Design a protein around this motif. Structure first.
Motif, PDB file in Angstrom:
ATOM      1  N   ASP B  91     -98.287 -61.881  40.566  1.00 60.18           N
ATOM      2  CA  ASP B  91     -97.448 -61.189  41.549  1.00 60.18           C
ATOM      3  C   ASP B  91     -96.119 -61.913  41.815  1.00 60.18           C
ATOM      4  N   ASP B  93     -92.712 -61.068  42.589  1.00 52.03           N
ATOM      5  CA  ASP B  93     -91.900 -60.796  43.783  1.00 52.03           C
ATOM      6  C   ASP B  93     -92.661 -61.083  45.098  1.00 52.03           C
ATOM      7  N   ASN B  95     -95.723 -59.565  47.188  1.00 49.58           N
ATOM      8  CA  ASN B  95     -96.036 -58.705  48.332  1.00 49.58           C
ATOM      9  C   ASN B  95     -97.494 -58.255  48.370  1.00 49.58           C
ATOM     10  N   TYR B  97     -99.425 -57.200  45.892  1.00 50.78           N
ATOM     11  CA  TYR B  97     -99.772 -56.093  45.001  1.00 50.78           C
ATOM     12  C   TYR B  97     -99.316 -56.400  43.589  1.00 50.78           C
ATOM     13  N   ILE B  98    -100.026 -55.854  42.601  1.00 54.56           N
ATOM     14  CA  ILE B  98     -99.638 -56.000  41.198  1.00 54.56           C
ATOM     15  C   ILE B  98     -99.331 -54.625  40.622  1.00 54.56           C
ATOM     16  N   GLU B 102     -95.480 -55.659  36.616  1.00 54.05           N
ATOM     17  CA  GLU B 102     -95.867 -57.038  36.863  1.00 54.05           C
ATOM     18  C   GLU B 102     -97.031 -57.476  35.973  1.00 54.05           C
TER      19      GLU B 102
HETATM   20 CA   LIG Z   1     -96.146 -57.069  43.840  1.00 59.25          CA
END
Ligand SMILES: [Ca+2]
Ligand SMILES: [Ca+2]
Ligand SMILES: [Ca+2]
Ligand SMILES: [Ca+2]
Lengths: 824, 145, 78
Positions: B91, B93, B95, B97-98, B102
């Motif tokens: 991950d 960036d 946040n 979530y993938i 990504e």
């Molecule tokens: Ca993400």
């Protein structure tokens, strides 16, 4: 299989393609492809399953779906036609002699290429065998031995030069030991090599070339061990054969000054040469260089013996040039020739019955010159040698009772044996000297380990076989137990490194055959020693004794029970058949008792030991200090037969082998004419049988004889899978394919680097991939979830691996940055 | 000591280090995987930890040695902190979530060839609740399986 | 103590020995590793052994990585 083509016997190619058109009790009937009609019968165990693609080859013969003698022959054949002379079977190497200089494979850039790289990661090559022995030597701290097989012309010499030159260039400071062995070879070949029926230039001794390494695994020196020189050749040979090369080289190339000193003649004049072939090897040019007073009557009639490289005149000069280049001087060159000459004259000494004065024997009148020359050359007195060759000496007691010495006249046959017994001891000690002098070229005070190449006369059988074939075939039966044991251990260790299971492997052991020969008190060898003790030693009694002590033995059968018809009239007491690893061999027991005696009585033993000639004393001056060690113990070892002497020396060979990790090279000879690009199938097949290669292919069927790496199964079957699966890496491709198809667990096993199969299951696997495309397509659809999960965890656990190695670098460097308790 | 099911999963991850398929690795190979996933060890530190497990002395690791090469005296919470640190390499960036983009970037960095459509297919199977992105809770249920 | 300022009157890592150089030996004596804690770090370079950890082998690492004790400073150790 079921209609598919097969391999079947063929007189000149070994195997030919055909179809099984009919079946029978012990025979299939095969219809050829090429003849399209000329049908022949063939035993069932002589036809085999063939590969689908007859244009494919493989670097390891285990990649083949069926692994037998017929598919192996065809695999190396296709590879031979591309100049790829090397091919593995597991860790075993197969080197077919190209008979030309193959470019780039013996380069300096190629030696570097193989350094470190393990067996299988590189193409098949002798360099890879060399490097596996070195790698195992230093890691396991264990001496190694590369056992190479093959008759003369098979490329054993070229193969051994390639080993030595690889190991010095890679792991040696300079070191030119390969070049001193080759320059010293003509000398060993003179005293050690001889013409057999099947091979003009044939080594009749087990040579064990060896490079020795110090504690740090670096070449310090060299050594050439020798075993089992054929003694019987010294005194007598069959027609079509010859004594050792030194005799004829010396009778052709010596100057006329030398010829007068040693009283040489044409070889028809000597007993030890004239019962066998008397002709020299020579071409048109070298026949002119030999004087007419050296040529035998039969050399004048029939002409010369032909060979592309052997030449008795030319080889005397090449042997003389050898002596110089090693270090031998002019005094020590005439010394060797004086003892060879002294052996020749000895043989010409004959005997005749006495006047019943404890009716011994006496020297003949015609044989007075014999005695005169033999004695001056061997540094013996004339009279003392006449007495020792015709009379023994014995004690009047045997136990601890006091007994004076007496003189016992020998019989005629007893005196013949003494004369021959002295001849074989003298030549032998002379051979041990030549070999020792080669070793003084590259000596070394102390050593830890060694890597040695070993070649000894292979298994063989002719129309008529005798005690000489019995001993060679006995030597090879024990060498095939070693071979088979080490390949079995190599296989059982490969299945554990790969993690397959408990999977046990069936193994027909050949110990019952070796016991038939060498068991104490009931084996053929001790039954033959037992016959030497009866009041009327007969060869028939010996043979009947053998059959009785082994009633329903699996390996012993009577001559009449031979599959050939040439042994149809041999009586039960006139022979026996041994079921050796390579085949049945009908022996004829005539003369077996005579060939089992070469005992030299001590009185005559002490005569040569204390010769007036300093050099001949030095041949037994190892024996002045080593009898000084034994002498009493050495006189007890003079009572041993040539059979039990053969066993004992052979057992020292095997003990040396036992304490060393063994690799194996199988040098093949493609044809008899020494020419390139001519694969004679039947001759190579016969070589594969006698070298014990076929016996090993039987062994591996007991385990998992078929294996393909993941990258191999990926190249074969990716085209039949969907585009999604083809994108995968070879290991995941195979994992998905193995699970999709849902194969039996006892037949197929998914190992660490390769997929393994039981006999004929790689074929079964291959038919699942091609017989039903709709079924296979559905099974891959059904595993699509498992594959998405498999690819997730592969990259997820790989990222957790890198973080765990990040945690290892810090954890370790925390104790190595908390070492400060020392610094200050 | 690890589980039998934990050994199986590291065995397949060991195939990304051992690309050629010989069952063995060096610092040139295990180094290039480390560098591909955000880490940056020098050509020196990894030499010392190779030297623990490698009993033969030569520079080559088989799988059972690779297992004891990364095994260490671990703290109670260390195990969970590593699983979370794995998610964070996926991950970029950051946040929680993938995405498809990504996951595709980690795949290509480890040496896995696949279309963009194949990448979305993976994300979809792991994605339980159905928002087209892989949260930590779901990343662990795939890991365990 | 009384013995700590008297022993100091007559008159710990080397990497993190800069930042400092009375109040200096305050946090030096406060964060001192135990005896049993340092006995764990002895089993660090223990490949196998049985309490020991080699003689010649335990040195290549001390000169190749971390706060590297010199090759000359090593000769004045073993
Ligand atoms: Ca993400
Ligand atoms: Ca690798
Ligand atoms: Ca290793
Ligand atoms: Ca989601």
């Amino acid at each position: 299989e079921d209609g598919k083509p097969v391999w079947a016997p063929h007189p000149t190619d070994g195997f030919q393609v055909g179809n099984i058109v009919d079946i029978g009790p012990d025979s299939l009937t095969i219809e050829p492809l090429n003849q399209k009609g000329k049908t022949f019968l063939a035993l069932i165990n002589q036809v085999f399953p063939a590969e689908e693609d007859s244009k494919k080859d493989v670097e390891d013969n285990c990649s083949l779906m069926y692994l037998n003698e017929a598919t192996l022959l065809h695999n190396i054949k296709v590879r031979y036609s591309k100049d790829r002379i090397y091919t593995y079977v597991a860790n075993i190497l197969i080197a077919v002699n190209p008979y030309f200089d193959i470019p780039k494979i013996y380069s300096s850039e190629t030696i570097k290429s193989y350094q470190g790289k393990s067996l299988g990661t590189m193409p098949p090559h002798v360099f890879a065998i060399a490097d596996k022995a070195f790698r195992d030597m230093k890691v396991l701290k264990l001496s190694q031995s590369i056992i190479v097989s093959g008759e003369s012309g098979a490329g054993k010499t070229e193969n051994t030069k390639f080993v030595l030159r690889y190991l010095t260039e890679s792991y040696g400071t300079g070191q030119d030991i390969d070049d001193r062995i080759v320059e010293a070879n003509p000398l060993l070949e003179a005293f050690g090599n001889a013409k057999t029926v099947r091979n003009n230039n044939s080594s009749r001794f087990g040579k064990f070339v060896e490079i020795h390494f110090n504690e740090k695994s670096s070449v310090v020196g060299g050594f050439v061990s020798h075993y089992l020189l054929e003694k019987s050749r010294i005194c007598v040979q069959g027609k079509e054969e010859r004594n050792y090369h030194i005799f004829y080289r010396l009778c052709a190339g010596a100057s006329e000054d030398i010829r007068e000193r040693l009283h040489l003649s044409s070889p028809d004049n000597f007993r030890y040469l004239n019962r066998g072939c008397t002709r020299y090897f020579a071409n048109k040019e070298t026949d002119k260089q030999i004087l007419q007073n050296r040529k035998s009557p039969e050399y004048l009639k029939a002409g010369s013996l032909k060979d592309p490289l052997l030449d008795d005149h030319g080889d005397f000069i090449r042997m003389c040039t050898a002596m110089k280049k090693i270090g031998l001087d002019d005094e020590e060159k005439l010394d060797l020739f004086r003892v060879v000459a002294g052996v020749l004259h000895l043989g010409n000494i004959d005997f005749e019955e006495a006047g019943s004065t404890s009716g011994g024997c006496n020297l003949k009148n015609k044989s007075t010159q014999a005695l005169e020359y033999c004695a001056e050359l061997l540094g013996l007195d004339q009279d003392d040698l006449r007495v020792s060759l015709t009379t023994r000496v014995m004690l009047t007691t045997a136990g601890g009772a006091k007994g004076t010495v007496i003189k016992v006249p020998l019989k005629v046959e007893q005196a013949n044996n003494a004369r021959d017994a002295l001849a074989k001891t003298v030549y032998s000690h002379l051979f041990d000297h030549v070999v020792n002098r080669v070793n003084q070229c590259f000596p070394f005070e102390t050593s830890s380990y060694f890597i040695g190449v070993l070649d000894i006369a292979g298994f063989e059988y002719f129309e008529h076989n005798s005690f000489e074939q019995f001993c060679i075939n006995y030597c090879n039966e024990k060498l095939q137990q070693f071979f088979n044991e080490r390949i079995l251990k190599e296989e059982q260790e490969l299945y554990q490194k790969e993690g397959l299971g408990v999977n046990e492997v069936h193994y027909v052991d050949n110990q019952d055959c070796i016991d038939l020969i060498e068991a104490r008190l009931v084996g053929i060898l001790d039954i033959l020693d037992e016959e030497n003790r009866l009041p009327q030693p007969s060869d028939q009694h010996f043979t009947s004794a053998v059959h009785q002590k082994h009633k329903d033995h699996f390996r012993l059968s009577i001559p009449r029970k031979s599959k050939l018809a040439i042994h149809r009239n041999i009586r039960d007491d006139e022979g026996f058949i041994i079921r050796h690893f390579a085949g049945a061999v009908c022996y004829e027991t005539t003369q077996f008792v005579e060939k089992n005696n070469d005992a030299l009585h001590m009185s005559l033993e002490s005569l040569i030991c204390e010769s007036r000639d300093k050099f001949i004393r030095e041949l037994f001056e190892s024996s002045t200090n080593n009898n000084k060690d034994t002498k009493q113990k050495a006189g007890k070892l003079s009572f041993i037969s040539v059979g039990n002497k053969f066993k004992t020396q052979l057992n020292l060979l095997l003990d040396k082998l036992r304490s060393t990790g063994a690799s194996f090279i199988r040098c093949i000879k493609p044809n008899l004419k020494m020419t390139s690009h001519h694969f004679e199938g039947a001759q190579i097949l016969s070589q594969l049988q006698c070298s014990g290669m076929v016996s090993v292919l039987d062994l591996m069927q007991g385990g998992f004889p078929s294996r393909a790496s993941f990258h191999e199964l990926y190249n074969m079957y990716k085209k039949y899978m969907p585009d999604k699966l083809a994108r995968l890496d070879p290991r995941l491709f195979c994992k998905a394919l193995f699970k999709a198809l849902g194969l039996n667990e006892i037949d197929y096993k998914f190992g660490l680097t390769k997929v393994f199969f039981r006999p004929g299951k790689f074929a079964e696997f291959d038919q699942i991939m091609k017989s039903d495309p709709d079924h296979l397509a559905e099974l891959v659809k059904r595993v699509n979830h498992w594959l998405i999960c498999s690819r997730w965890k592969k990259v997820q656990w790989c990222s957790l691996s890198v973080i765990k190695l990040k945690n290892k670098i810090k954890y370790r460097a925390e104790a190595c940055i908390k070492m400060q308790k020392t610094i200050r | 000591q690890l589980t039998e099911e934990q050994i199986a999963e590291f065995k397949e991850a060991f195939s990304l280090f051992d690309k050629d398929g010989d069952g063995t690795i060096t610092t040139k190979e295990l180094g290039t995987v480390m560098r591909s996933l955000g880490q940056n060890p020098t050509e020196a530190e990894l030499q010392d930890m190779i030297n623990e497990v490698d009993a033969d002395g030569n520079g080559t690791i088989d799988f059972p040695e690779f297992l004891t090469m990364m095994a260490r005296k671990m703290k109670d919470t260390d195990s969970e902190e590593e699983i979370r640190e794995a998610f964070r390499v996926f991950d970029k960036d950051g946040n929680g979530y993938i995405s498809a983009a990504e996951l595709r970037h980690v795949m290509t960095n480890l040496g896995e060839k696949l279309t963009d459509e194949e990448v979305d297919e993976m994300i979809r199977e792991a994605d339980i609740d159905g928002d087209g992105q892989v949260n930590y809770e779901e990343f662990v249920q795939m890991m365990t399986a």
